[PDB]
Amino acid sequence: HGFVSGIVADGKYYGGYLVNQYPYMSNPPDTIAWSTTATDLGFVDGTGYQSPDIICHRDAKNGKLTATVAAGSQIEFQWTTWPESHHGPLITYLAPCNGDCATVDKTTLKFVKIAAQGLIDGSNPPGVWADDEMIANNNTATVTIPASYAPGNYVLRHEIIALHSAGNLNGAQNYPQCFNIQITGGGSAQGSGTAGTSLYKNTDPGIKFDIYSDLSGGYPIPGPALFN
Ligand SMILES: [Cu+2]
Ligand code: NA
Numbered sequence: 001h002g003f004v005s006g007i008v009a010d011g012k013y014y015g016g017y018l019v020n021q022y023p024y025m026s027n028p029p030d031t032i033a034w035s036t037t038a039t040d041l042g043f044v045d046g047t048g049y050q051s052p053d054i055i056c057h058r059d060a061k062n063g064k065l066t067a068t069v070a071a072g073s074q075i076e077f078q079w080t081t082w083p084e085s086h087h088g089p090l091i092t093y094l095a096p097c098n099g100d101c102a103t104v105d106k107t108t109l110k111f112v113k114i115a116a117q118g119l120i121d122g123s124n125p126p127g128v129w130a131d132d133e134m135i136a137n138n139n140t141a142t143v144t145i146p147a148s149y150a151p152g153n154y155v156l157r158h159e160i161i162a163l164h165s166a167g168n169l170n171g172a173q174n175y176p177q178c179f180n181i182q183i184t185g186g187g188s189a190q191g192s193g194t195a196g197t198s199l200y201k202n203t204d205p206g207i208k209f210d211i212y213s214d215l216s217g218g219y220p221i222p223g224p225a226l227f228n
């Protein structure tokens with residue numbers, strides 16, 4: 001359980017969607033981050049992978065602002081202190097808005113995986129994962145926007161999947177957080193994206209996964225193919 005309280009792009013801090021405050025308001029502050037009703041600091045599990053809830057989290061609605069970021073530069077995601085128990089991958093996607101992301105319909109978004117990290121060291125299960133590296137780095141995740149990516153408005157979908165109960169069907173806990181960005185000084189490339197409700201299925205090999213047994217088979221990161 002946790003959320004992203006803010007991000008850093010082009011060296012500028014942007015406050016996130018404060019999920020333990022903003023839902024409890026008629027007129028929450030404008031943010032680059034999508035609103036959600038995930039007030040338990042909870043998650044979407046396999047029972048929701050084909051629901052629109054998986055796209056930007058429960059009941060998500062468009063953020064009203066957008067952050068600029070240079071192609072080839074790093075975005076930092078400041079998570080609220082993440083439990084060491086909740087081992088799992090960090091995955092980050094871009095979907096083009098083909099206009100202002102403040103008025104994109106989330107169900108139309110086609111996400112391209114631009115970064116993913118999984119199991120770092122599984123010699124002693126449950127081992128060391130991408131979220132453990134995040135924790136050690138001042139509870140901050142980092143993602144490079146590809147220098148080749150075309151300039152435009154995109155929803156940036158950053159996600160932890162906690163696998164501590166993922167041996168059970170619908171046991172994995174997905175924590176997606178969305179942000180509106182405008183990539184500047186870009187290239188000409190863009191991936192072929194996947195609809196949010198097509199990213200994951202509950203029987204995927206990296207979803208229904210036992211972190212506590214021998215990990216000599218590694219960990220296949222779920223979701224569609226990583227953009228090169
Ligand atoms: Cu939790
Ligand atoms: Na962890």
